[PDB]
């Protein structure tokens, strides 16, 4: 249907737009759809965009407002004192600013239906919350409404929340549009999503990005499918793969890397209320942390990422135990039986499942997939669902039987309960993934392992030697391979801290030249350089010029294969702000070839400073430009938990950057 209103280019410039003669007559029913085009580049703090408003005194509570705040949350109020209804909804992190230098236009819609009793907002074609209510509060049977106002909320008369920005389209219908005809709405987004919520993972949340370009030209990215809410493990997280063939313009549907199967796979609405958002699966096996690399060699892909037992994050990891033990400089992954007190087993060579207290091998065998055989068939454990149905976290069988894996909380088998890293590899550039294999403890029986560096690994240009960063306490310890990633060493390089989360990533400046720029607890990003090709690494130094939180956010970087200004140059991305995971910038760094110092000279502004931008992944594409998939939100802010669709994904050009 046709709008009863519609009108452009109003400029709100702190003085509010009166449009009251031109739309309160004009509103009718108790159902309605607002359809607003917007720019806000330089919003105040808190901004109303729309209001509708008993102006008259003692009737300030009266009034429905679409809201947003500086930190890019946008919200509604609808609010009436006689039947005593105050609802707020609202989502963080839900606008884009800028784009290129330029002021994005933002689609805001907003539906209010009184048939479902439910109100829904979508910004930039993005569901960001849709509420139902017992008692319906229709937007224009607030009790006197008399005024309609862009720009600010006509409150006894004065203007409150005095917005700055512009509405270059709204639009007003009598009726709440469906999804389906929402989903006509053209669209000005700035941006692409790869990985979404209702794509094939059913995962509703996604953290952890990677982005890596294959010798074919084809761009590949993994992430952390995460289905218990955004939280780390303790929870269900799989690792999900997207490709593109045509330089980051359109993405595959994702496939799985890396899978458990003891819990399903469900796309389900986190709670984000305060007591309930800390609620976390507690049962379930997973993954956490990826990282790609290439092989020139065999041509291989190969992604690793933590693996994690059921029930079991770093905070509970077993840390004075690898999980293995030694056998004449081999080492064997431990198992737990039903009902023993201690690891009395082991998986030796073909899987077989052997007893340790009396040498004795058992009839029972471990499979490539991890999963136990009995005889050689194979045992089978019934799957967990999860639901907030009873008002609290229930995590409960589904009547479904799945292969039983030494990883799921109901197997006969159970390895230790800490922190493994795992290796899968696509011999078809991503289209499908190898069965995960462990990688081997680097630091000893009694130490447990180190955490992968999440993004890319480093395939030196001049050789093939591969290298992947992890990090422990007081040191990176970087896996390094000569053989397509068969064989793993490790090469330690000790830094001044204890238990930081250093995640670190590399760049090489020159043939067998590598610099590693990584996170720290001092609110400067750090580096050190190897100049053997990651065999010996110089001690650490901190970049000036960049600022991170005490608690610090990944740095993804890359070496960007054009000289700029005459120079070798290296891009950085994090967040630049000692406050919050916000403020997203690429800086471009150029080398300096006397003594490969980095002047960090232009600072690209990815949004506002004080839009969220936190975990990140950097490519540079076939086509010389830059790809960038990067949380777009505060992902440390305990306000910001459970946000839908904030990974996304944007395509810059270096004249852009500087
Ligand atoms: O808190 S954030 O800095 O956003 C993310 C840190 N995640 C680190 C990490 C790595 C591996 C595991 Cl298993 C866990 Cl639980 C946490």
Redesign the pocket.
Same mark, same amino acid.
């Given at each position: 249907i046709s709008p009863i209103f519609q009108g452009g280019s109003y400029q709100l410039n702190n003085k509010s737009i009166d449009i009251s003669s031109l739309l309160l007559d004009k509103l009718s029913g108790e159902s309605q759809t607002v359809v607003m085009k917007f720019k806000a580049d330089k919003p105040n703090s808190l901004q109303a965009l729309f209001g509708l408003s008993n102006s008259k005194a003692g009737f300030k509570n009266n009034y429905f407002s679409i809201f947003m705040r500086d930190s890019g949350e946008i919200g509604v109020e609808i609010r009436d004192a006689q039947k005593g209804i105050n609802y707020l909804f609202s989502r963080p992190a839900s606008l884009w600013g800028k784009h290129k230098g330029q002021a994005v236009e933002n689609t805001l819609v907003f539906v209010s239906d009184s048939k479902d009793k439910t109100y829904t907002m979508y910004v930039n074609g993005i569901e960001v919350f849709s509420e139902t209510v017992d008692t319906f509060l229709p937007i224009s049977n607030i009790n006197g409404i008399d005024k309609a106002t862009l720009g600010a909320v006509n409150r006894e008369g004065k203007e409150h929340y005095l917005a700055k920005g512009s509405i270059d389209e709204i639009s007003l219908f009598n009726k709440a549009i469906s999804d389906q005809e929402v989903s006509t709405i053209p669209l000005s987004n700035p941006f692409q999503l790869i990985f979404q919520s209702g794509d094939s993972t059913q995962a509703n949340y996604f953290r952890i990005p990677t982005l890596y370009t294959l010798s074919s030209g084809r761009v590949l990215s993994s992430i952390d499918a995460r289905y218990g809410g955004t939280h780390? &493990?303790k929870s269900k997280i799989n690792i999900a793969t997207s490709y593109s063939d045509d330089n980051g313009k359109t993405w595959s549907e994702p496939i799985f890397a890396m899978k458990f199967n003891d819990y399903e796979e469900q796309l389900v609405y986190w709670p984000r209320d305060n007591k309930l958002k800390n609620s976390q699966i507690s049962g379930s096996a997973s993954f956490?942390?990826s990282s790609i690399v290439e092989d020139k060699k065999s041509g291989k892909t190969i992604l690793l990422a933590?693996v994690?037992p059921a029930g079991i994050?770093?905070?509970n990891?077993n840390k004075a135990d690898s999980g293995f033990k030694e056998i004449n400089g081999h080492y064997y992954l431990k198992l737990k039986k039903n009902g023993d007190n201690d690891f009395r087993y082991t998986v030796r060579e073909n899987g077989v499942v052997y007893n340790e207290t009396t040498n004795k091998p058992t009839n029972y065998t471990i499979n490539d997939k991890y999963e136990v055989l009995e005889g050689g068939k194979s045992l089978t454990v019934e799957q967990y669902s999860v639901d907030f149905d009873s008002g609290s976290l229930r995590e409960r069988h589904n009547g479904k039987q799945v292969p039983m894996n030494v990883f799921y909380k109901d197997s006969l088998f159970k390895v230790t309960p800490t922190?493994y890293i795992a290796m899968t590899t696509s011999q078809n550039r991503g289209e499908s993934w190898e069965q995960f294999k462990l990688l081997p403890p680097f630091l000893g029986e009694k130490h447990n392992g180190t955490?992968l560096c999440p993004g890319q690994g480093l395939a030196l240009k001049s050789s093939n030697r591969l290298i992947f960063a992890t990090y422990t306490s007081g040191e990176l310890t970087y896996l390094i391979s000569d053989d397509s990633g068969q064989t793993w060493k490790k090469s330690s390089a000790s830094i001044p801290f204890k238990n930081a989360?250093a995640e670190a990533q590399m760049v090489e400046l020159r043939d067998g030249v590598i610099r590693t720029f990584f996170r720290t607890t001092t609110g400067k990003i750090a580096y050190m350089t190897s100049r053997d090709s990651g065999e010996t690494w110089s001690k650490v130094s901190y970049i000036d010029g960049i600022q991170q939180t005490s608690?610090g956010?990944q740095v993804s970087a890359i070496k960007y294969s054009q000289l700029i200004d005459g120079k070798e140059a290296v891009i950085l991305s994090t967040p630049n702000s000692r406050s919050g995971r916000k403020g997203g910038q690429l800086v471009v760094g150029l080398v300096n070839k006397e003594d490969d110092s980095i002047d960090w000279k232009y600072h690209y502004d990815i949004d506002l400073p004080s839009y969220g931008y936190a975990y990140s992944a950097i490519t540079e594409l076939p086509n010389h430009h830059i790809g960038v998939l990067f949380e777009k939100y505060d &992902?440390?802010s305990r306000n910001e938990l459970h946000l839908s669709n904030v990974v996304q994904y944007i395509d810059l050009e270096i004249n852009d950057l500087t």
């Open positions: 780390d &493990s956490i942390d933590d994690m994050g770093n905070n990891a922190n955490y989360t608690y956010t &992902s440390w």
